[PDB]
Amino acid sequence: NLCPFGEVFNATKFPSVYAWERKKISNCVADYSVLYNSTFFSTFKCYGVSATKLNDLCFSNVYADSFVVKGDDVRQIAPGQTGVIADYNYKLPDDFMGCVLAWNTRNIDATSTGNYNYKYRLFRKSNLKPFERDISTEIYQAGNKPCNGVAGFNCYFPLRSYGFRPTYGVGHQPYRVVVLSFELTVCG
């Protein structure tokens, strides 16, 4: 059987960047022709391996990470970036070997009243290690007086919502991102 990339790319619902989910790809032949013979993607940026040698290559397993960031936040899904998404939400290793794909989704992920489902982490003590995931809603304590569970002055709730609206600029529109990691069962 061929690998189910349709279960991740054309998936109806996408998770937030802070709670991004990962799918492991096992014993299956992969079909990279549909991702390549389509201009549907807005970016399609590869790292560590070329965009055309993965066809006649084999990998130990493939991991697909899917999530949603704003228009201007896509550049941080790259090895060695220091934004809020890269440092507090999703950090890629410097030796990442794979491709990052993104496409505009204002028509599906942005409603008139603002889609406040997609969120991201804004505050965190220390940065995220490569491929780490943090989903805690514990009140971020910026000061010395303890929060005691209740947020407020110098005690800010960590996660904030994007709030996508169709009237926003293209740099503030929802983009669905998929990160295909190659680790060294899956061939072409």
Partner: protein, 595 residues
């Protein structure tokens, strides 16, 4: 340190304010393009939530010790949030002060005056009174419109402006200011880098000092126009006295533009008003803005976003809605850029499209700055950035290359005096009017003019500074200052003086980087990706660096300069001194058309 604690505090503000400011900005757009009593609340309540947030964060940032910061971006972000604001006022005196501002704004807009010869006709300021003051040649008709506005809607503003002064003085005095006049001068204040600081009182000294190199040019334009006005209104004007206030082309004399029909040097020549050419080529509002879009990309600047082309109101609503037809350039945030303008197929609205789209380019560039630093360098930077666009868009070299003027249009040495004269009636004519107005309110806020002689000293300054005399005597029941919009609607007015000097400092520096070769008034920076990048560098700056620095990055000066403006009108200045050899340059502050 209080550094990271304020660092990770302005970040909480930058994310919570951008959402609230959009709820408030999108509310103002929905009212101005669909006037509804429901939208009045949406425009107010969605702004009131934003009005309560800015006060909480202003107070919370005041806890953070300002000096204990070592990085300059954060230093500049805090001081913008360190302002106490207007909530230092009492609970009820805030509501009465907030209510008199509506009553002044309403009687300024609802203000109707009725004709004694025809009582069924009653006119508004727009388009009723402004059309008389801008086109009538009857001394008595123009006098009626000038006086009826200052005696009927002007006298209603007298009791309100008296309380308007006393209440907003109590607001500024509690915020460590001398008066409401000192409150506005804080715009140009800089307390930072060595060699870039600027005092609030330094602003008063600078507008006066630079005004002296303007008096030579203005006195001769006054003498030339007065000689031309003695022909249109014979036996009414003294060849040595001031100009009557109602003959100056509009309601207040703010611009002498409409006097061009009476003061044209060589009217026998073909007119440069290209309004007819646009109409017979089937131009619409799309063609104006689409053509204006092509102007900005020709220098490397980005196209208008597709959200601009879909969310902007570039026409009168047509087939449903009520609209505030004032042209405005709107920066809602989150990349949402819109322009609201009831565009007509004319040259005047064609040049304004370059001005308003110029604002958007300034807005688009500094979008990378933090939310607190997304603003002009000072109050006069935005209006000067839009004017340099229309200066390049009005040149004959630009109009023909666009296809509007004929390729064989003769650009004589006289067609340029005709052009620079019309430019002088609009650009330099408004300079003494602007200074006298803001100097008067500066002194009234200062308390130097007692309320029992507000109007006596106002006209003593009109004759001395502007060379304009009142046609009928006014006692203290009148309130001619508040007869202007910016005065009765709580708006600073010195910005129009500062922006005017800036727009020629920029034009001089930009055409030098664009390598223009003829006179400055003939410069068109189209196709100048070289000069475009020079301007881009200060557009991205925003409110981060002081205005003394942002100005220095392009013009090379730490302060405003009058030398660029005088060089622009140098062909006209020397031509006026030839005309006025048998004329009287200057005026007597003692003649009045009644006495």
């Amino acid at each position: 340190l209080t550094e990271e604690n304020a660092k990770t505090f302005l970040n909480n503000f930058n994310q919570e304010a951008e959402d609230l400011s959009y709820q408030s900005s999108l509310a103002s757009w929905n009212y101005n393009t669909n006037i509804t009593e429901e939208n009045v609340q949406n425009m107010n309540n969605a702004g009131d939530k934003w009005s309560a947030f800015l006060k909480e964060q202003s107070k919370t940032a005041q806890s953070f010790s300002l000096q204990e910061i070592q990085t300059p971006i954060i230093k500049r972000q805090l001081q913008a949030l360190q302002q106490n604001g207007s909530s230092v006022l009492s609970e009820d005196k805030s509501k009465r002060l907030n209510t008199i501002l509506n009553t002044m704004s309403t009687i300024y807009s609802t203000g109707k005056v009725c004709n004694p010869d025809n009582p069924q006709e009653c006119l508004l300021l727009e388009p009723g009174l402004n059309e008389i003051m801008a086109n009538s040649l009857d001394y008595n008709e123009r006098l009626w419109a000038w006086e009826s506005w200052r005696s009927e809607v002007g006298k209603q503003l007298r009791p309100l402006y008296e309380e308007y002064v006393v209440l907003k003085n109590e607001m500024a005095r509690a915020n460590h200011y001398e008066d409401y006049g000192d409150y506005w001068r804080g715009d140009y204040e800089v307390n930072g880098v060595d060699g870039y600081d600027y005092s609030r009182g330094q602003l008063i000294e600078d507008v006066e000092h630079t005004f002296e190199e303007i008096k030579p040019l203005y006195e001769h334009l006054h003498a030339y126009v007065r000689a031309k006005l003695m022909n249109a209104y014979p036996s009414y004007i003294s060849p040595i006295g001031c100009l009557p206030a109602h003959l100056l082309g509009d309601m207040w004399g703010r611009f002498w533009t409409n006097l061009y029909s009476l003061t044209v040097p060589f009217g026998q020549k073909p007119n440069i008003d290209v309004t007819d050419a646009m109409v017979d080529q089937a131009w619409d509002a799309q063609r104006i803005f689409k053509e204006a879009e092509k102007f900005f990309v020709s220098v490397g600047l980005p196209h208008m976003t597709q959200g601009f082309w879909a969310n902007s109101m570039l026409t009168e609503p047509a087939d449903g809605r009520k609209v505030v037809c004032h042209p405005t350039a709107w920066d809602l945030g989150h990349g949402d850029f819109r322009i609201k303008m009831c565009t007509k197929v004319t040259m005047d609205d064609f040049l304004t499209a370059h001005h308003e789209m110029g604002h958007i380019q300034y807005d688009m560039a500094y979008a990378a700055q933090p939310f607190l630093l997304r603003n002009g360098a000072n109050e006069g930077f935005h209006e000067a950035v839009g004017e340099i666009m229309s200066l390049s868009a009005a040149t004959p070299k630009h109009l023909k290359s666009i296809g509007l003027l004929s390729p064989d249009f003769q650009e004589d040495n006289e067609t340029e005096i005709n052009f620079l004269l019309k430019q002088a009636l609009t650009i330099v004519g408004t300079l003494p009017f602007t200074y006298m107005l803001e100097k008067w309110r500066w002194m009234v806020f200062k308390g130097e003019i007692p309320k029992d002689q507000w109007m006596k000293k106002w006209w003593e300054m009109k004759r001395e500074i502007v060379g304009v005399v009142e046609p009928v005597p006014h006692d203290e029941t009148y309130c001619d200052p508040a007869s202007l919009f910016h005065v009765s609607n709580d708006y600073s007015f010195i910005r129009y003086y500062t922006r005017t000097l800036y727009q020629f400092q920029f034009q001089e520096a930009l055409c030098q980087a664009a390598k223009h070769e003829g006179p400055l008034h003939k410069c068109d920076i189209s196709n100048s990706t070289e000069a475009g990048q020079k301007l881009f560098n200060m557009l991205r700056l925003g409110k981060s660096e002081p205005w003394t620095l942002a100005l220095e990055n392009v013009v090379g000066a730490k302060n405003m300069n009058v030398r660029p403006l005088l060089n622009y009108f140098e062909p006209l200045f020397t031509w006026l001194k030839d005309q006025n050899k048998n004329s009287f340059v200057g005026w007597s502050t003692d003649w009045s058309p009644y006495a």
